[PDB]
Design an enzyme around this catalytic site. Structure first.
Site, PDB file in Angstrom:
ATOM      1  N   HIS A   1      42.032  33.199  36.654  1.00  0.00           N
ATOM      2  CA  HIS A   1      41.110  33.314  35.498  1.00  0.00           C
ATOM      3  C   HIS A   1      39.915  34.329  35.780  1.00  0.00           C
ATOM      4  O   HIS A   1      39.416  34.761  34.724  1.00  0.00           O
ATOM      5  CB  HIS A   1      40.541  32.013  35.256  1.00  0.00           C
TER       6      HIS A   1
ATOM      7  N   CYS B   1      54.498  40.633  37.725  1.00  0.00           N
ATOM      8  CA  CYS B   1      53.951  41.897  37.779  1.00  0.00           C
ATOM      9  C   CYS B   1      54.643  42.999  38.052  1.00  0.00           C
ATOM     10  O   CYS B   1      54.350  44.144  37.610  1.00  0.00           O
ATOM     11  CB  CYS B   1      52.725  41.901  38.876  1.00  0.00           C
TER      12      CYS B   1
END
Ligand SMILES: CCCCCCCCCCCCCC(=O)O
Ligand SMILES: CCCCCCCCCCCCCC(=O)O
Lengths: 359, 368
Positions: free
Chosen positions: B196, B150
């Protein structure tokens, strides 16, 4: 200002694998006549491996599918120790304190995990927690140059700081011994290894000491229509490389124009070069590199030696050759000028013009 | 006198910035219901209404009739990387073009291309296709940055920063491309269910150049004043990235938010001090919008008003977490709309990488 390789070290996993034996061993696994052939033309005598892929234990594991994750952990298990030791040695000779190392560049195409070997090196060596880090993955056999370039720019931007470049390649960890010809080829050529460089910036006026290597000019060249030359991918059971039969030809026609232009930009000719650190990725890679430049075959002596003793250790190979050249002078001249180059995926020619200071 | 050579005296400036994502818009509410269908599936609804996400973009529809037969098979990692390449190329080529679109820089002026990702990995990759597609110089320098997670936009940006300041006449192109949808698997554990429900797809590019400090820059330009990195002690288990037979995955620790809270303030405070600033001086906090808990703790750590994190919440709500790409989506919003009337807004951006490293930068956005 000049960029200098002020420190350098190489390392390899202890296990020595004999090609003559590897050939016999691998053959035992119809048309088993091929294997002995490919292993004969490899021109490799030995290569080091962190793992014995033919060990009774790994044999069952090797035949299993969906094992990349376990293999990536294996990679980390064996890579950390090697990279730490090789990095410690690269710095062993310099006075530089941990606070002067501002960048760590890690290059690999044989293992993917985070946090990786770079994090382990910073902690294991006691480097600053605020040190900059970049991980270069999947740039293949020429990654050391992409890595070194990053260190070169860094050091030029922060002259008072140093950069640590670490290349780690552990192919044995991705061994599968598949049926196809290309798999048989890479499994007979690839080896394990590690190398590290300590880079720094220096004034042009500074009189450098013997052994130091000045990175004069770096270059890159995406060769038109050769994308299928070198392919890297990740399979459920390991990382793979797919070499094209057209590669050596891509190399024959691509090396010369690139090198010649770069030298001309530096007022030099191919006949002016003392050292040719050609990536020893295989007999043909070397064969065609020499043929492209039209230089004496012996000028590739150091490149063949490396291949013979370690096989193709990917990005690492180029640094071993450089070490050989720093260790053994090819002439009696003060300062030897060399050119190093290797080939990357899209089939990019990667290299540099360098000076090794003899006296 | 063997002193170190004098340092370049120029400052790196983001001169171009573009944003992009696949066209498919997945509604978070619909996503929750469709995933819930896959005993007591009560687990799904909770781990979805607590995401603080309204929509996110995806190159692939993980629950599509087709993929639902491929999604459940083992050993599909190689096909998924091809799937990554297939969708990543078009998107990265498009965004890269948008970033260069307004600049007068000729192709020969672009000497470096940095490509970051943690969701792909392929032989000639997305970087090669960009050079070929945009007609960049065959001799451009390239660096591929994988698995820095990230916070990779910062590692990538730093690379372009050094290059440009070392070679003042050139420009660098930075491209972050993240295709999470391509690694959809839908496993049983919370971490998987959580990932998810949070991860999305996106792309962003920056065009960097060196600039002389007396140059009166035009509005919209972003000056990269200072960058910083900090490995946080005993936090290795915080952000774990790995490659599974059925796709790349990210394993987050329950302790991550605690690492963020106690790690942010000290690093940000020390860095600002180096630049004669305190946390209260800052306009704009480009906090990596990795998820409600990440933004949450980053703001508490700094002891700042929750409203100073509006840009980050907005991105998370409209796109979910697009890994390295998100920080740049955040910066674009701050560029497009001033947070105050002062000429020159000063901001700090940061994200979190594996090993748990705080990656960030101090920056200036010229308003006038
Ligand atoms: C990025 C390309 C990675 C290629 C990895 C190839 C792994 C298999 C070859 C190296 C191990 C050979 C072991 C043996 O045959 O004795
Ligand atoms: C480097 C980290 C890679 C993480 C990949 C996570 C893949 C699954 C989450 C993204 C797709 C979500 C699909 C959905 O549920 O709607």
């Amino acid at each position: 200002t000049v960029a200098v390789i002020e420190g350098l070290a190489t390392g390899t996993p202890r296990r020595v694998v004999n090609q003559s034996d590897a050939a016999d061993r691998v053959a035992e696994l119809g048309q088993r006549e091929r294997i002995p052939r490919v292993y004969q033309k490899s021109r490799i005598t030995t290569r080091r491996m962190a793992v014995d892929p033919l060990d009774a234990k790994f044999d069952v594991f090797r035949r299993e599918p969906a094992t990349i994750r376990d293999r990536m952990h294996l990679f980390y298990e064996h890579a950390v120790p090697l990279a730490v030791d090789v990095s410690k040695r690269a710095l062993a000779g310099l006075p530089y304190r941990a606070a002067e190392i501002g960048l760590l560049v890690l290059a690999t195409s044989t293992g993917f995990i985070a946090p990786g070997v770079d994090v382990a090196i910073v902690k294991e060596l006691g480097l600053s927690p605020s040190i900059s880090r970049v991980v270069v993955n999947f740039m293949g056999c020429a990654a050391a140059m992409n890595a070194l370039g990053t260190a070169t720019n860094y050091v030029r931007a922060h002259p008072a700081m140093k950069a640590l470049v670490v290349c780690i390649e552990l192919c044995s960890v991705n061994a599968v011994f598949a049926d196809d010809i290309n798999d048989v080829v890479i499994h007979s050529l690839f080896g394990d290894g590690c190398a590290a460089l300590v880079i720094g910036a220096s004034q042009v006026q500074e009189k450098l000491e013997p052994g130091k290597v000045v990175v004069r000019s770096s270059f890159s060249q995406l060769l038109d229509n050769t994308e299928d030359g070198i392919v890297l991918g990740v399979n459920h059971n390991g990382i793979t490389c797919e070499l094209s039969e057209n590669l050596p030809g891509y190399i024959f026609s691509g090396v010369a124009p690139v090198v010649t232009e770069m030298l001309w930009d530096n007022g030099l000719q191919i006949s002016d070069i003392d050292l040719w650190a050609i990536h020893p990725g295989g007999p043909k890679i070397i064969e065609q590199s020499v043929r492209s430049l039209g230089i004496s075959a012996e000028l590739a002596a150091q490149s063949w030696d490396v291949l013979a003793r370690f096989g193709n250790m990917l990005s690492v190979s180029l640094i071993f050759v450089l070490e050989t050249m720093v260790q053994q002078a090819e002439s009696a001249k003060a300062i030897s000028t060399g050119v190093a180059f290797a080939f990357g995926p899209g089939v990019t020619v990667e290299g540099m013009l360098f000076d090794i200071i003899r006296r």
